[PDB]
Amino acid sequence: TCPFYKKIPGTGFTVDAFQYGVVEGCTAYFLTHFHSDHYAGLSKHFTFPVYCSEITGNLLKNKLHVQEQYIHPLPLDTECIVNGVKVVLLDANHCPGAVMILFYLPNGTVILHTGDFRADPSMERSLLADQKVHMLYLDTTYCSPEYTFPSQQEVIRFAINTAFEAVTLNPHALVVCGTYSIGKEKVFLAIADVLGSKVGMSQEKYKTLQCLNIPEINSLITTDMCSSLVHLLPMMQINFKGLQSHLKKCGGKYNQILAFRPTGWTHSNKFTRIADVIPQTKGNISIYGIPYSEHSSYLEMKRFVQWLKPQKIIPTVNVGTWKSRSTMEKYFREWKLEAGY
Ligand code: NI
């Protein structure tokens, strides 16, 4: 059964609620982004209307084979009417095609559902600036002050410099990057660009990337592994055994692997600045864990919420424990008392 924080009161609408069978009274199903915890339950057999971005809709059609007649893509930053209710999709600064959704309820209530997001000051100059929001359904993934990590730009700078240095010192090194979902494409694309290589990958991953409207993509990716010195592999293979095994397959073209595991936050962020990060090494294989986040840091989330001044906040992440729920409620009250709304 569908939980309360996936329902939009005063509408026939749900958000990210595909794993509960037919939801009672739901006339339209919104999908914020193509990540499996959110799309869970969609397939070619789904026969209700799905509302989403253009990119999410390309993925629904080509990866899950949802039939075209039930896909309703909407443009961003554009007031649209859906079953009698005005909605707007805004860029969530998450993975490709990820949106936040503003709902203008018939009774005058305004609701913002962030989906998954990485709050940024640029959002303070979207269509959010124009009006009041009564209820915020907030991605609270990292809602605790211990969650600090660098900007995406700093992390990419570290990665490009690291890869460029290693391959310039050794022209026979291979760079490997781990993946398990869409998002974080900048990591592997930036590395390939500085090295003048295309990124090589499986047919299934190439297919996924072809759905994402990235400019000049035919120029950056390939299924021909032998022509590439940046390879993508599944995240589970990014360990000394899986990499030793991959190196065997490259037929004596390479004698070293430098690999990257983009993670979210890890506890080493408590102690170690991005500049100071070092790999785990065994023989001719080095592995860097880099904190490339597509969710708000605590400080980024706090700044967004204190700007927005919502009347009520409903968390959508870490909602399963009393300890988490209590912690999050205490922060929302601090924020409110500090800023005065
Ligand atoms: Ni996500």
Curated annotation (Swiss-Prot):
Q: Name one GO biological process term.
A: cell division
Molecular functions per Gene Ontology: 5'-3' DNA exonuclease activity; beta-lactamase activity; damaged DNA binding; zinc ion binding
Q: Subcellular localization, per the record?
A: Nucleus
- At the top level, the lineage of the source is Eukaryota
State the GO CC annotations. fibrillar center; nucleoplasm
In what tissue types does this protein appear? Expressed in brain, heart, kidney, liver, pancreas, placenta and skeletal muscle.
**Induction context:** During mitosis. The mRNA encoding this protein contains an internal ribosome entry site (IRES) in its 5'-UTR. This 5'-UTR generally suppresses translation while specifically promoting expression during mitosis, when cap-dependent translation may be impaired.
Q: What's in the keyword line of the UniProt record?
A: Cell cycle, Cell division, DNA damage, DNA repair, Hydrolase, Isopeptide bond, Metal-binding, Mitosis, Nucleus, Phosphoprotein, Ubl conjugation, Zinc, Zinc-finger
- Family according to the record: Belongs to the DNA repair metallo-beta-lactamase (DRMBL) family.
Q: How does it assemble?
A: Binds constitutively to TP53BP1. Binds CDC27, which is itself a component of the anaphase promoting complex (APC). Binds PIAS1.
Protein role? May be required for DNA interstrand cross-link repair. Also required for checkpoint mediated cell cycle arrest in early prophase in response to mitotic spindle poisons. Possesses beta-lactamase activity, catalyzing the hydrolysis of penicillin G and nitrocefin. Exhibits no activity towards other beta-lactam antibiotic classes including cephalosporins (cefotaxime) and carbapenems (imipenem).
Name by which UniProt lists this protein: DNA cross-link repair 1A protein
- Of the intact sequence, the residues represented are 700 to 1040 of 1040
